[PDB]
Design a protein around this ligand. Structure first.
Ligand code: BEF
Ligand code: BEF
Ligand SMILES: [Mg+2]
Ligand SMILES: [Mg+2]
Ligand SMILES: [Mg+2]
Ligand SMILES: [Mg+2]
Lengths: 137, 137
């Protein structure tokens, strides 16, 4: 089953985000870029959420690669420093579907999640149709 | 072009929500259920957002019908009274994709919007494929 990947510098927000999502998804949790890529390798992930402000590699960077190695996956950013334009510009260059502000309702953040996974589902069958309708003409 | 429908009891939040979205969508605004249905008649709408707490008819009710008369349209609820279970249950029976808490970032609420419209787009071509791949077998 498609899980959701949680990826934040502070391990107390993975803790939280899980508490909000665990009841509905298979939550996978990671402490940063290099740590997280490791997981998308072995396990299968429908949705990912990433702190932007992370030591070393930023969410936007991580996700530029995620976009490249596993394009079937819905990418989401999350920020408490929502006031910066540089960021948004960065966000707006990458293929980032949702950007959430901190903090967040257990039921809101939960929703941006159910979204992503419904979306991941559309996109994924939206492609099936194609592939299979190619194998006709 | 597909617009977005805004539908809230307090005309000062339509004011706001527009200010957040106008730069990116064709915003249509309505003061409540009966008022809003009137608009989906003449004009074409890809995304709708509805206050739950509205005199007379509630968002969830409105949207149950919207779901029925214009199913191609992405439905969204928005609440400041996020603590009620009755609601969520109601929300969870209807076909409601996103539920936002008040208040909201200009760039968050903005995003739940861009979401919806990308989604409205998937769903709508996801169907094209079908219809057209039916006209083969
Ligand atoms: F700093 Be992260 F964006 F919360
Ligand atoms: F009362 Be609405 F939900 F803001
Ligand atoms: Mg629990
Ligand atoms: Mg941080
Ligand atoms: Mg403006
Ligand atoms: Mg109200």
């Amino acid at each position: 089953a498609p899980a959701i990947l949680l990826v934040d510098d502070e391990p107390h927000s993975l803790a939280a985000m899980k508490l909000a999502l665990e009841d509905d998804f298979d939550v996978l949790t990671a402490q940063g870029a290099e740590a997280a890529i490791a997981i998308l390798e072995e396990e299968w992930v429908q949705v990912i959420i990433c702190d932007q402000r992370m030591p070393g590699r930023t969410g936007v960077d991580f996700l530029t690669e995620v976009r490249e190695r596993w394009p079937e996956t819905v990418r989401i950013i999350i920020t408490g420093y929502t006031d910066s334009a540089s960021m948004m510009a960065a966000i707006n260059d990458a293929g980032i579907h949702q950007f959430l502000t901190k903090p967040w309702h257990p039921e809101q953040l939960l929703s941006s999640a159910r979204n992503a996974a419904r979306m991941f589902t559309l996109a994924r069958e939206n492609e099936r149709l194609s592939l299979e309708m190619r194998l006709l003409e």
